[PDB]
Amino acid sequence: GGIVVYWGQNGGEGTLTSTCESGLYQIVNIAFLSQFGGGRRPQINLAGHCDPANNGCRTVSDGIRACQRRGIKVMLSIGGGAGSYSLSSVQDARSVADYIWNNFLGGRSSSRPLGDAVLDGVDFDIEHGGAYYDALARRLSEHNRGGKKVFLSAAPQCPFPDQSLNKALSTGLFDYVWVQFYNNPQCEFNSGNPSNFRNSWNKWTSSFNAKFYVGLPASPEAAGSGYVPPQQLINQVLPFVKRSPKYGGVMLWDRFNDLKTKYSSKIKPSV
């Protein structure tokens, strides 16, 4: 399996290029298109990396390209925990999907926030609402016979169902789902009591036809709870999750914390 990582939300985590050159990752989610929908001006936020004001993040395309030249998928992650975003209608959702297509994917725009690189897909990290993200996914998906060629991923929290992502996920259009098994004590892995996690993984994987990733914090500093020491992950979680044919690997929040702990490097041989 593969390791998925988020990059973009910590200006101290190094470049996207470096992230991809590390060889640690199969997919990088650029976090985030933090503002969109509802008539909002779409905005990316890449923390201290670059100021998206008048597309000051255009150089990210170098990283995107560096990644793609190494066979690494680079997803635009939309939403996140800080931005102001929500969808007002199906038309709005389609409008946002079209905006994303034109500005980040295979469409055309004179003001592409991350430059001319064509991202591989869109990662739905939707933390409030839920309404119309199905329409958004469907509109993006329309390019999977039109295109090219748009992967869809979602980052639901582990408590099932995820109220923000359930509608989107119900479309069955998502290629990848990294379920966040942290900051959610009811479904986090605990060595002494692994059933909560195992039941959660089972339920998620059973509920959607996607490739599933175990979404985890890359450091204990990256989550209030749910961190799994890499050896526990390797010894206790992976033999179980690997039994799922839908098992895709492990997703890590985030590049910064992963760099700190070398978590991915420790689990890479085992994922």
- Domain extent, residue 267, equals 1-271
Distance CA 159, CA 157 (A): 6
Token output for 86:
């929500």
Reported structure resolution in angstroms: 1.7
CATH number at residue 25: 3.20.20.80
Number of domains the chain is built from: 1
Q: Is 71 exposed, middle or buried (0-12, 13-18, 19+ CB in 10 A)?
A: exposed
Catalytic residue among 127, 142, 188, 221: 127
Half-sphere exposure of 174 (CA within 13 A, CB side): 32
Q: Is 127 marked active-site?
A: yes
Distance CA 215, CA 154 (A): 11
